[PDB]
Amino acid sequence: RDFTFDLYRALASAAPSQNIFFSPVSISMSLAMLSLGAGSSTKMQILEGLGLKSSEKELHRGFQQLLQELNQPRDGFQLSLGNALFTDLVVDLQDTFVSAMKTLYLADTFPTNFRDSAGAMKQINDYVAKQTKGKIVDLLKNLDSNAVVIMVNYIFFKAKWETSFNHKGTQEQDFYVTSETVVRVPMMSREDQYHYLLDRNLSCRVVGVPYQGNATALFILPSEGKMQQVENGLSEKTLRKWLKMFKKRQLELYLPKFSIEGSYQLEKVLPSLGISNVFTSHADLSGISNHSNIQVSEMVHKAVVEVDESGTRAAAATGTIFTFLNSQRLVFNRPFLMFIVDNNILFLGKVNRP
Template identity: 50%
Template structure:
């Protein structure tokens, strides 16, 4: 498929805690206090000051912090492997989960998602995600972007009306009655839903449901966009991609000689190239100099990416970038536990906001994301919002930037300045 295609699904399976092993404690909700008149904020990836929709912008800022923290957690265990995930999918799913969480379970999840309740109230978090969902699912964009949530609920599980109302109102979640006593039937129902929402790209993800499972929580994102300036397939040639100093693989190397927003970070030793899509989204590709990948990864922070995007200059370059298709599948439970989110996965879990009593815990949390990058887009005309700070002087010879070694990729929705996907391409030939 000659387009950009990214998909992800996150599953959180909940099952009953064995009550004889756990006497639930009752805690009061802990609401954070914030200033009623917060200052203006810089968007986390665009550098543009936005004064309206402050609630959603505060959520976007925390989501960016979470994206880079989660990336570094994955990287610590997969330093030499491709990485690709949607931080927004994970944060949305677990934010929705906090509607039913209380006490330490609630505070651990919010801290894990990089929310500070002294800076943003719990109410604002959910309102911010609601605004994000509405903006990302706006139908007038030339980009196909669909994001949604779903709960598959066991016929015997009685959830509180407030929880059900909140997930529907704030997260626009669908709810489906499910017979978890028939695990094969339940798996088919859930997998059919996922396959339909991801246009057939993710199938049979749910397997071996826990015998005690009573609910599955899902978030999905489907993103499909076309380059504003497609690569000409006639110029795509087989070339070497250097996985490391000793290993190279053959790739289909796309090339283009056009105006791009670029920046070279002298301090971190890397090139940054922004490639716009038709519509309000862009891909930011980061190419570390030889031997500098770890240095760049260590510096991956919201302020770093903001600095890069504010420093972009439009200039003519000869760009080489490989076509690739990679995916990432992650055990979010394992990663979250290492980030301090522990109780929700144990018999200490307090999800009493769902049922009125502490009898549930999260047994499994999975995340899968897929990206396909190819040459061509559609022929439809469009306007792309691209922030340009400076215009460079003409170059006698176009600069050449060649992505023929491991690089980073961030896909940004420019309407909300949200990081939709991010990853590292170490070997473009490894799916």
């Protein structure tokens, strides 16, 4: 039972041969926020799902602390997170719950006339459009006239690498989406020391590329035909191992310049992972409203990330070395997994097609 990774597999299984990209920490946060107004067996699943009792008072203080940091402009690594709840006109909001939202999670709660589907969707999309300064302007594509409460979570990310990729080393190359399907993509490159590691167990190679700061981008390349195998091995433990075997190594790195995003209706997947009550009529959200017919109708999550050459410090030119074969080369030209960690797993995804 490893929520983050069970969520990944659940998503990859529901959408074979497609990119996958979500924010683990961000989703758990949304789920914690939600527990703040859930009761009995409903709050139980959420907490059990997250991986957590009673000391929950600290659970929220932790996230609150985390939010303030992220939303703190730390130039060269600016993360943009957002949460918001839209509740139908008939669900009366508890001031204790609304205040908690604003205070702990900096999230607003907006009454909404869900009987007016087109209007409600525009309101939700306009809100996120303003909040994200125009970066995400069409979060929702459809909306049901029977919605009671819609939860939205969005997160945009783009930091500068510690060191830029070669200013002239980006060339178009082949990327094998499959043994049959082949596409051209802009391929960045830079030779240097890198936290490398080979996992003969899961059969894959892992390389770490440092962002300007404390976050690290982890790129996993499964060996021929072993993506499924690696996916099944993904786990908190496995991750702790990798960070423990990482040793700097001279490396001719080849990595695609790409943009990836993911948008999911979490209510369609979380149930299969144990968090089901809250999404059903049997839900207990009495902490939000003592209205009987309350339940999360949709929990939409969207994460977006862009990877390019831009680094803080220009790349150091090798030059003619004189020592006692050929440096190790690693080109990401087959589907690969991507992690972005900074104490937490900020992001997790699969680049099936740049």
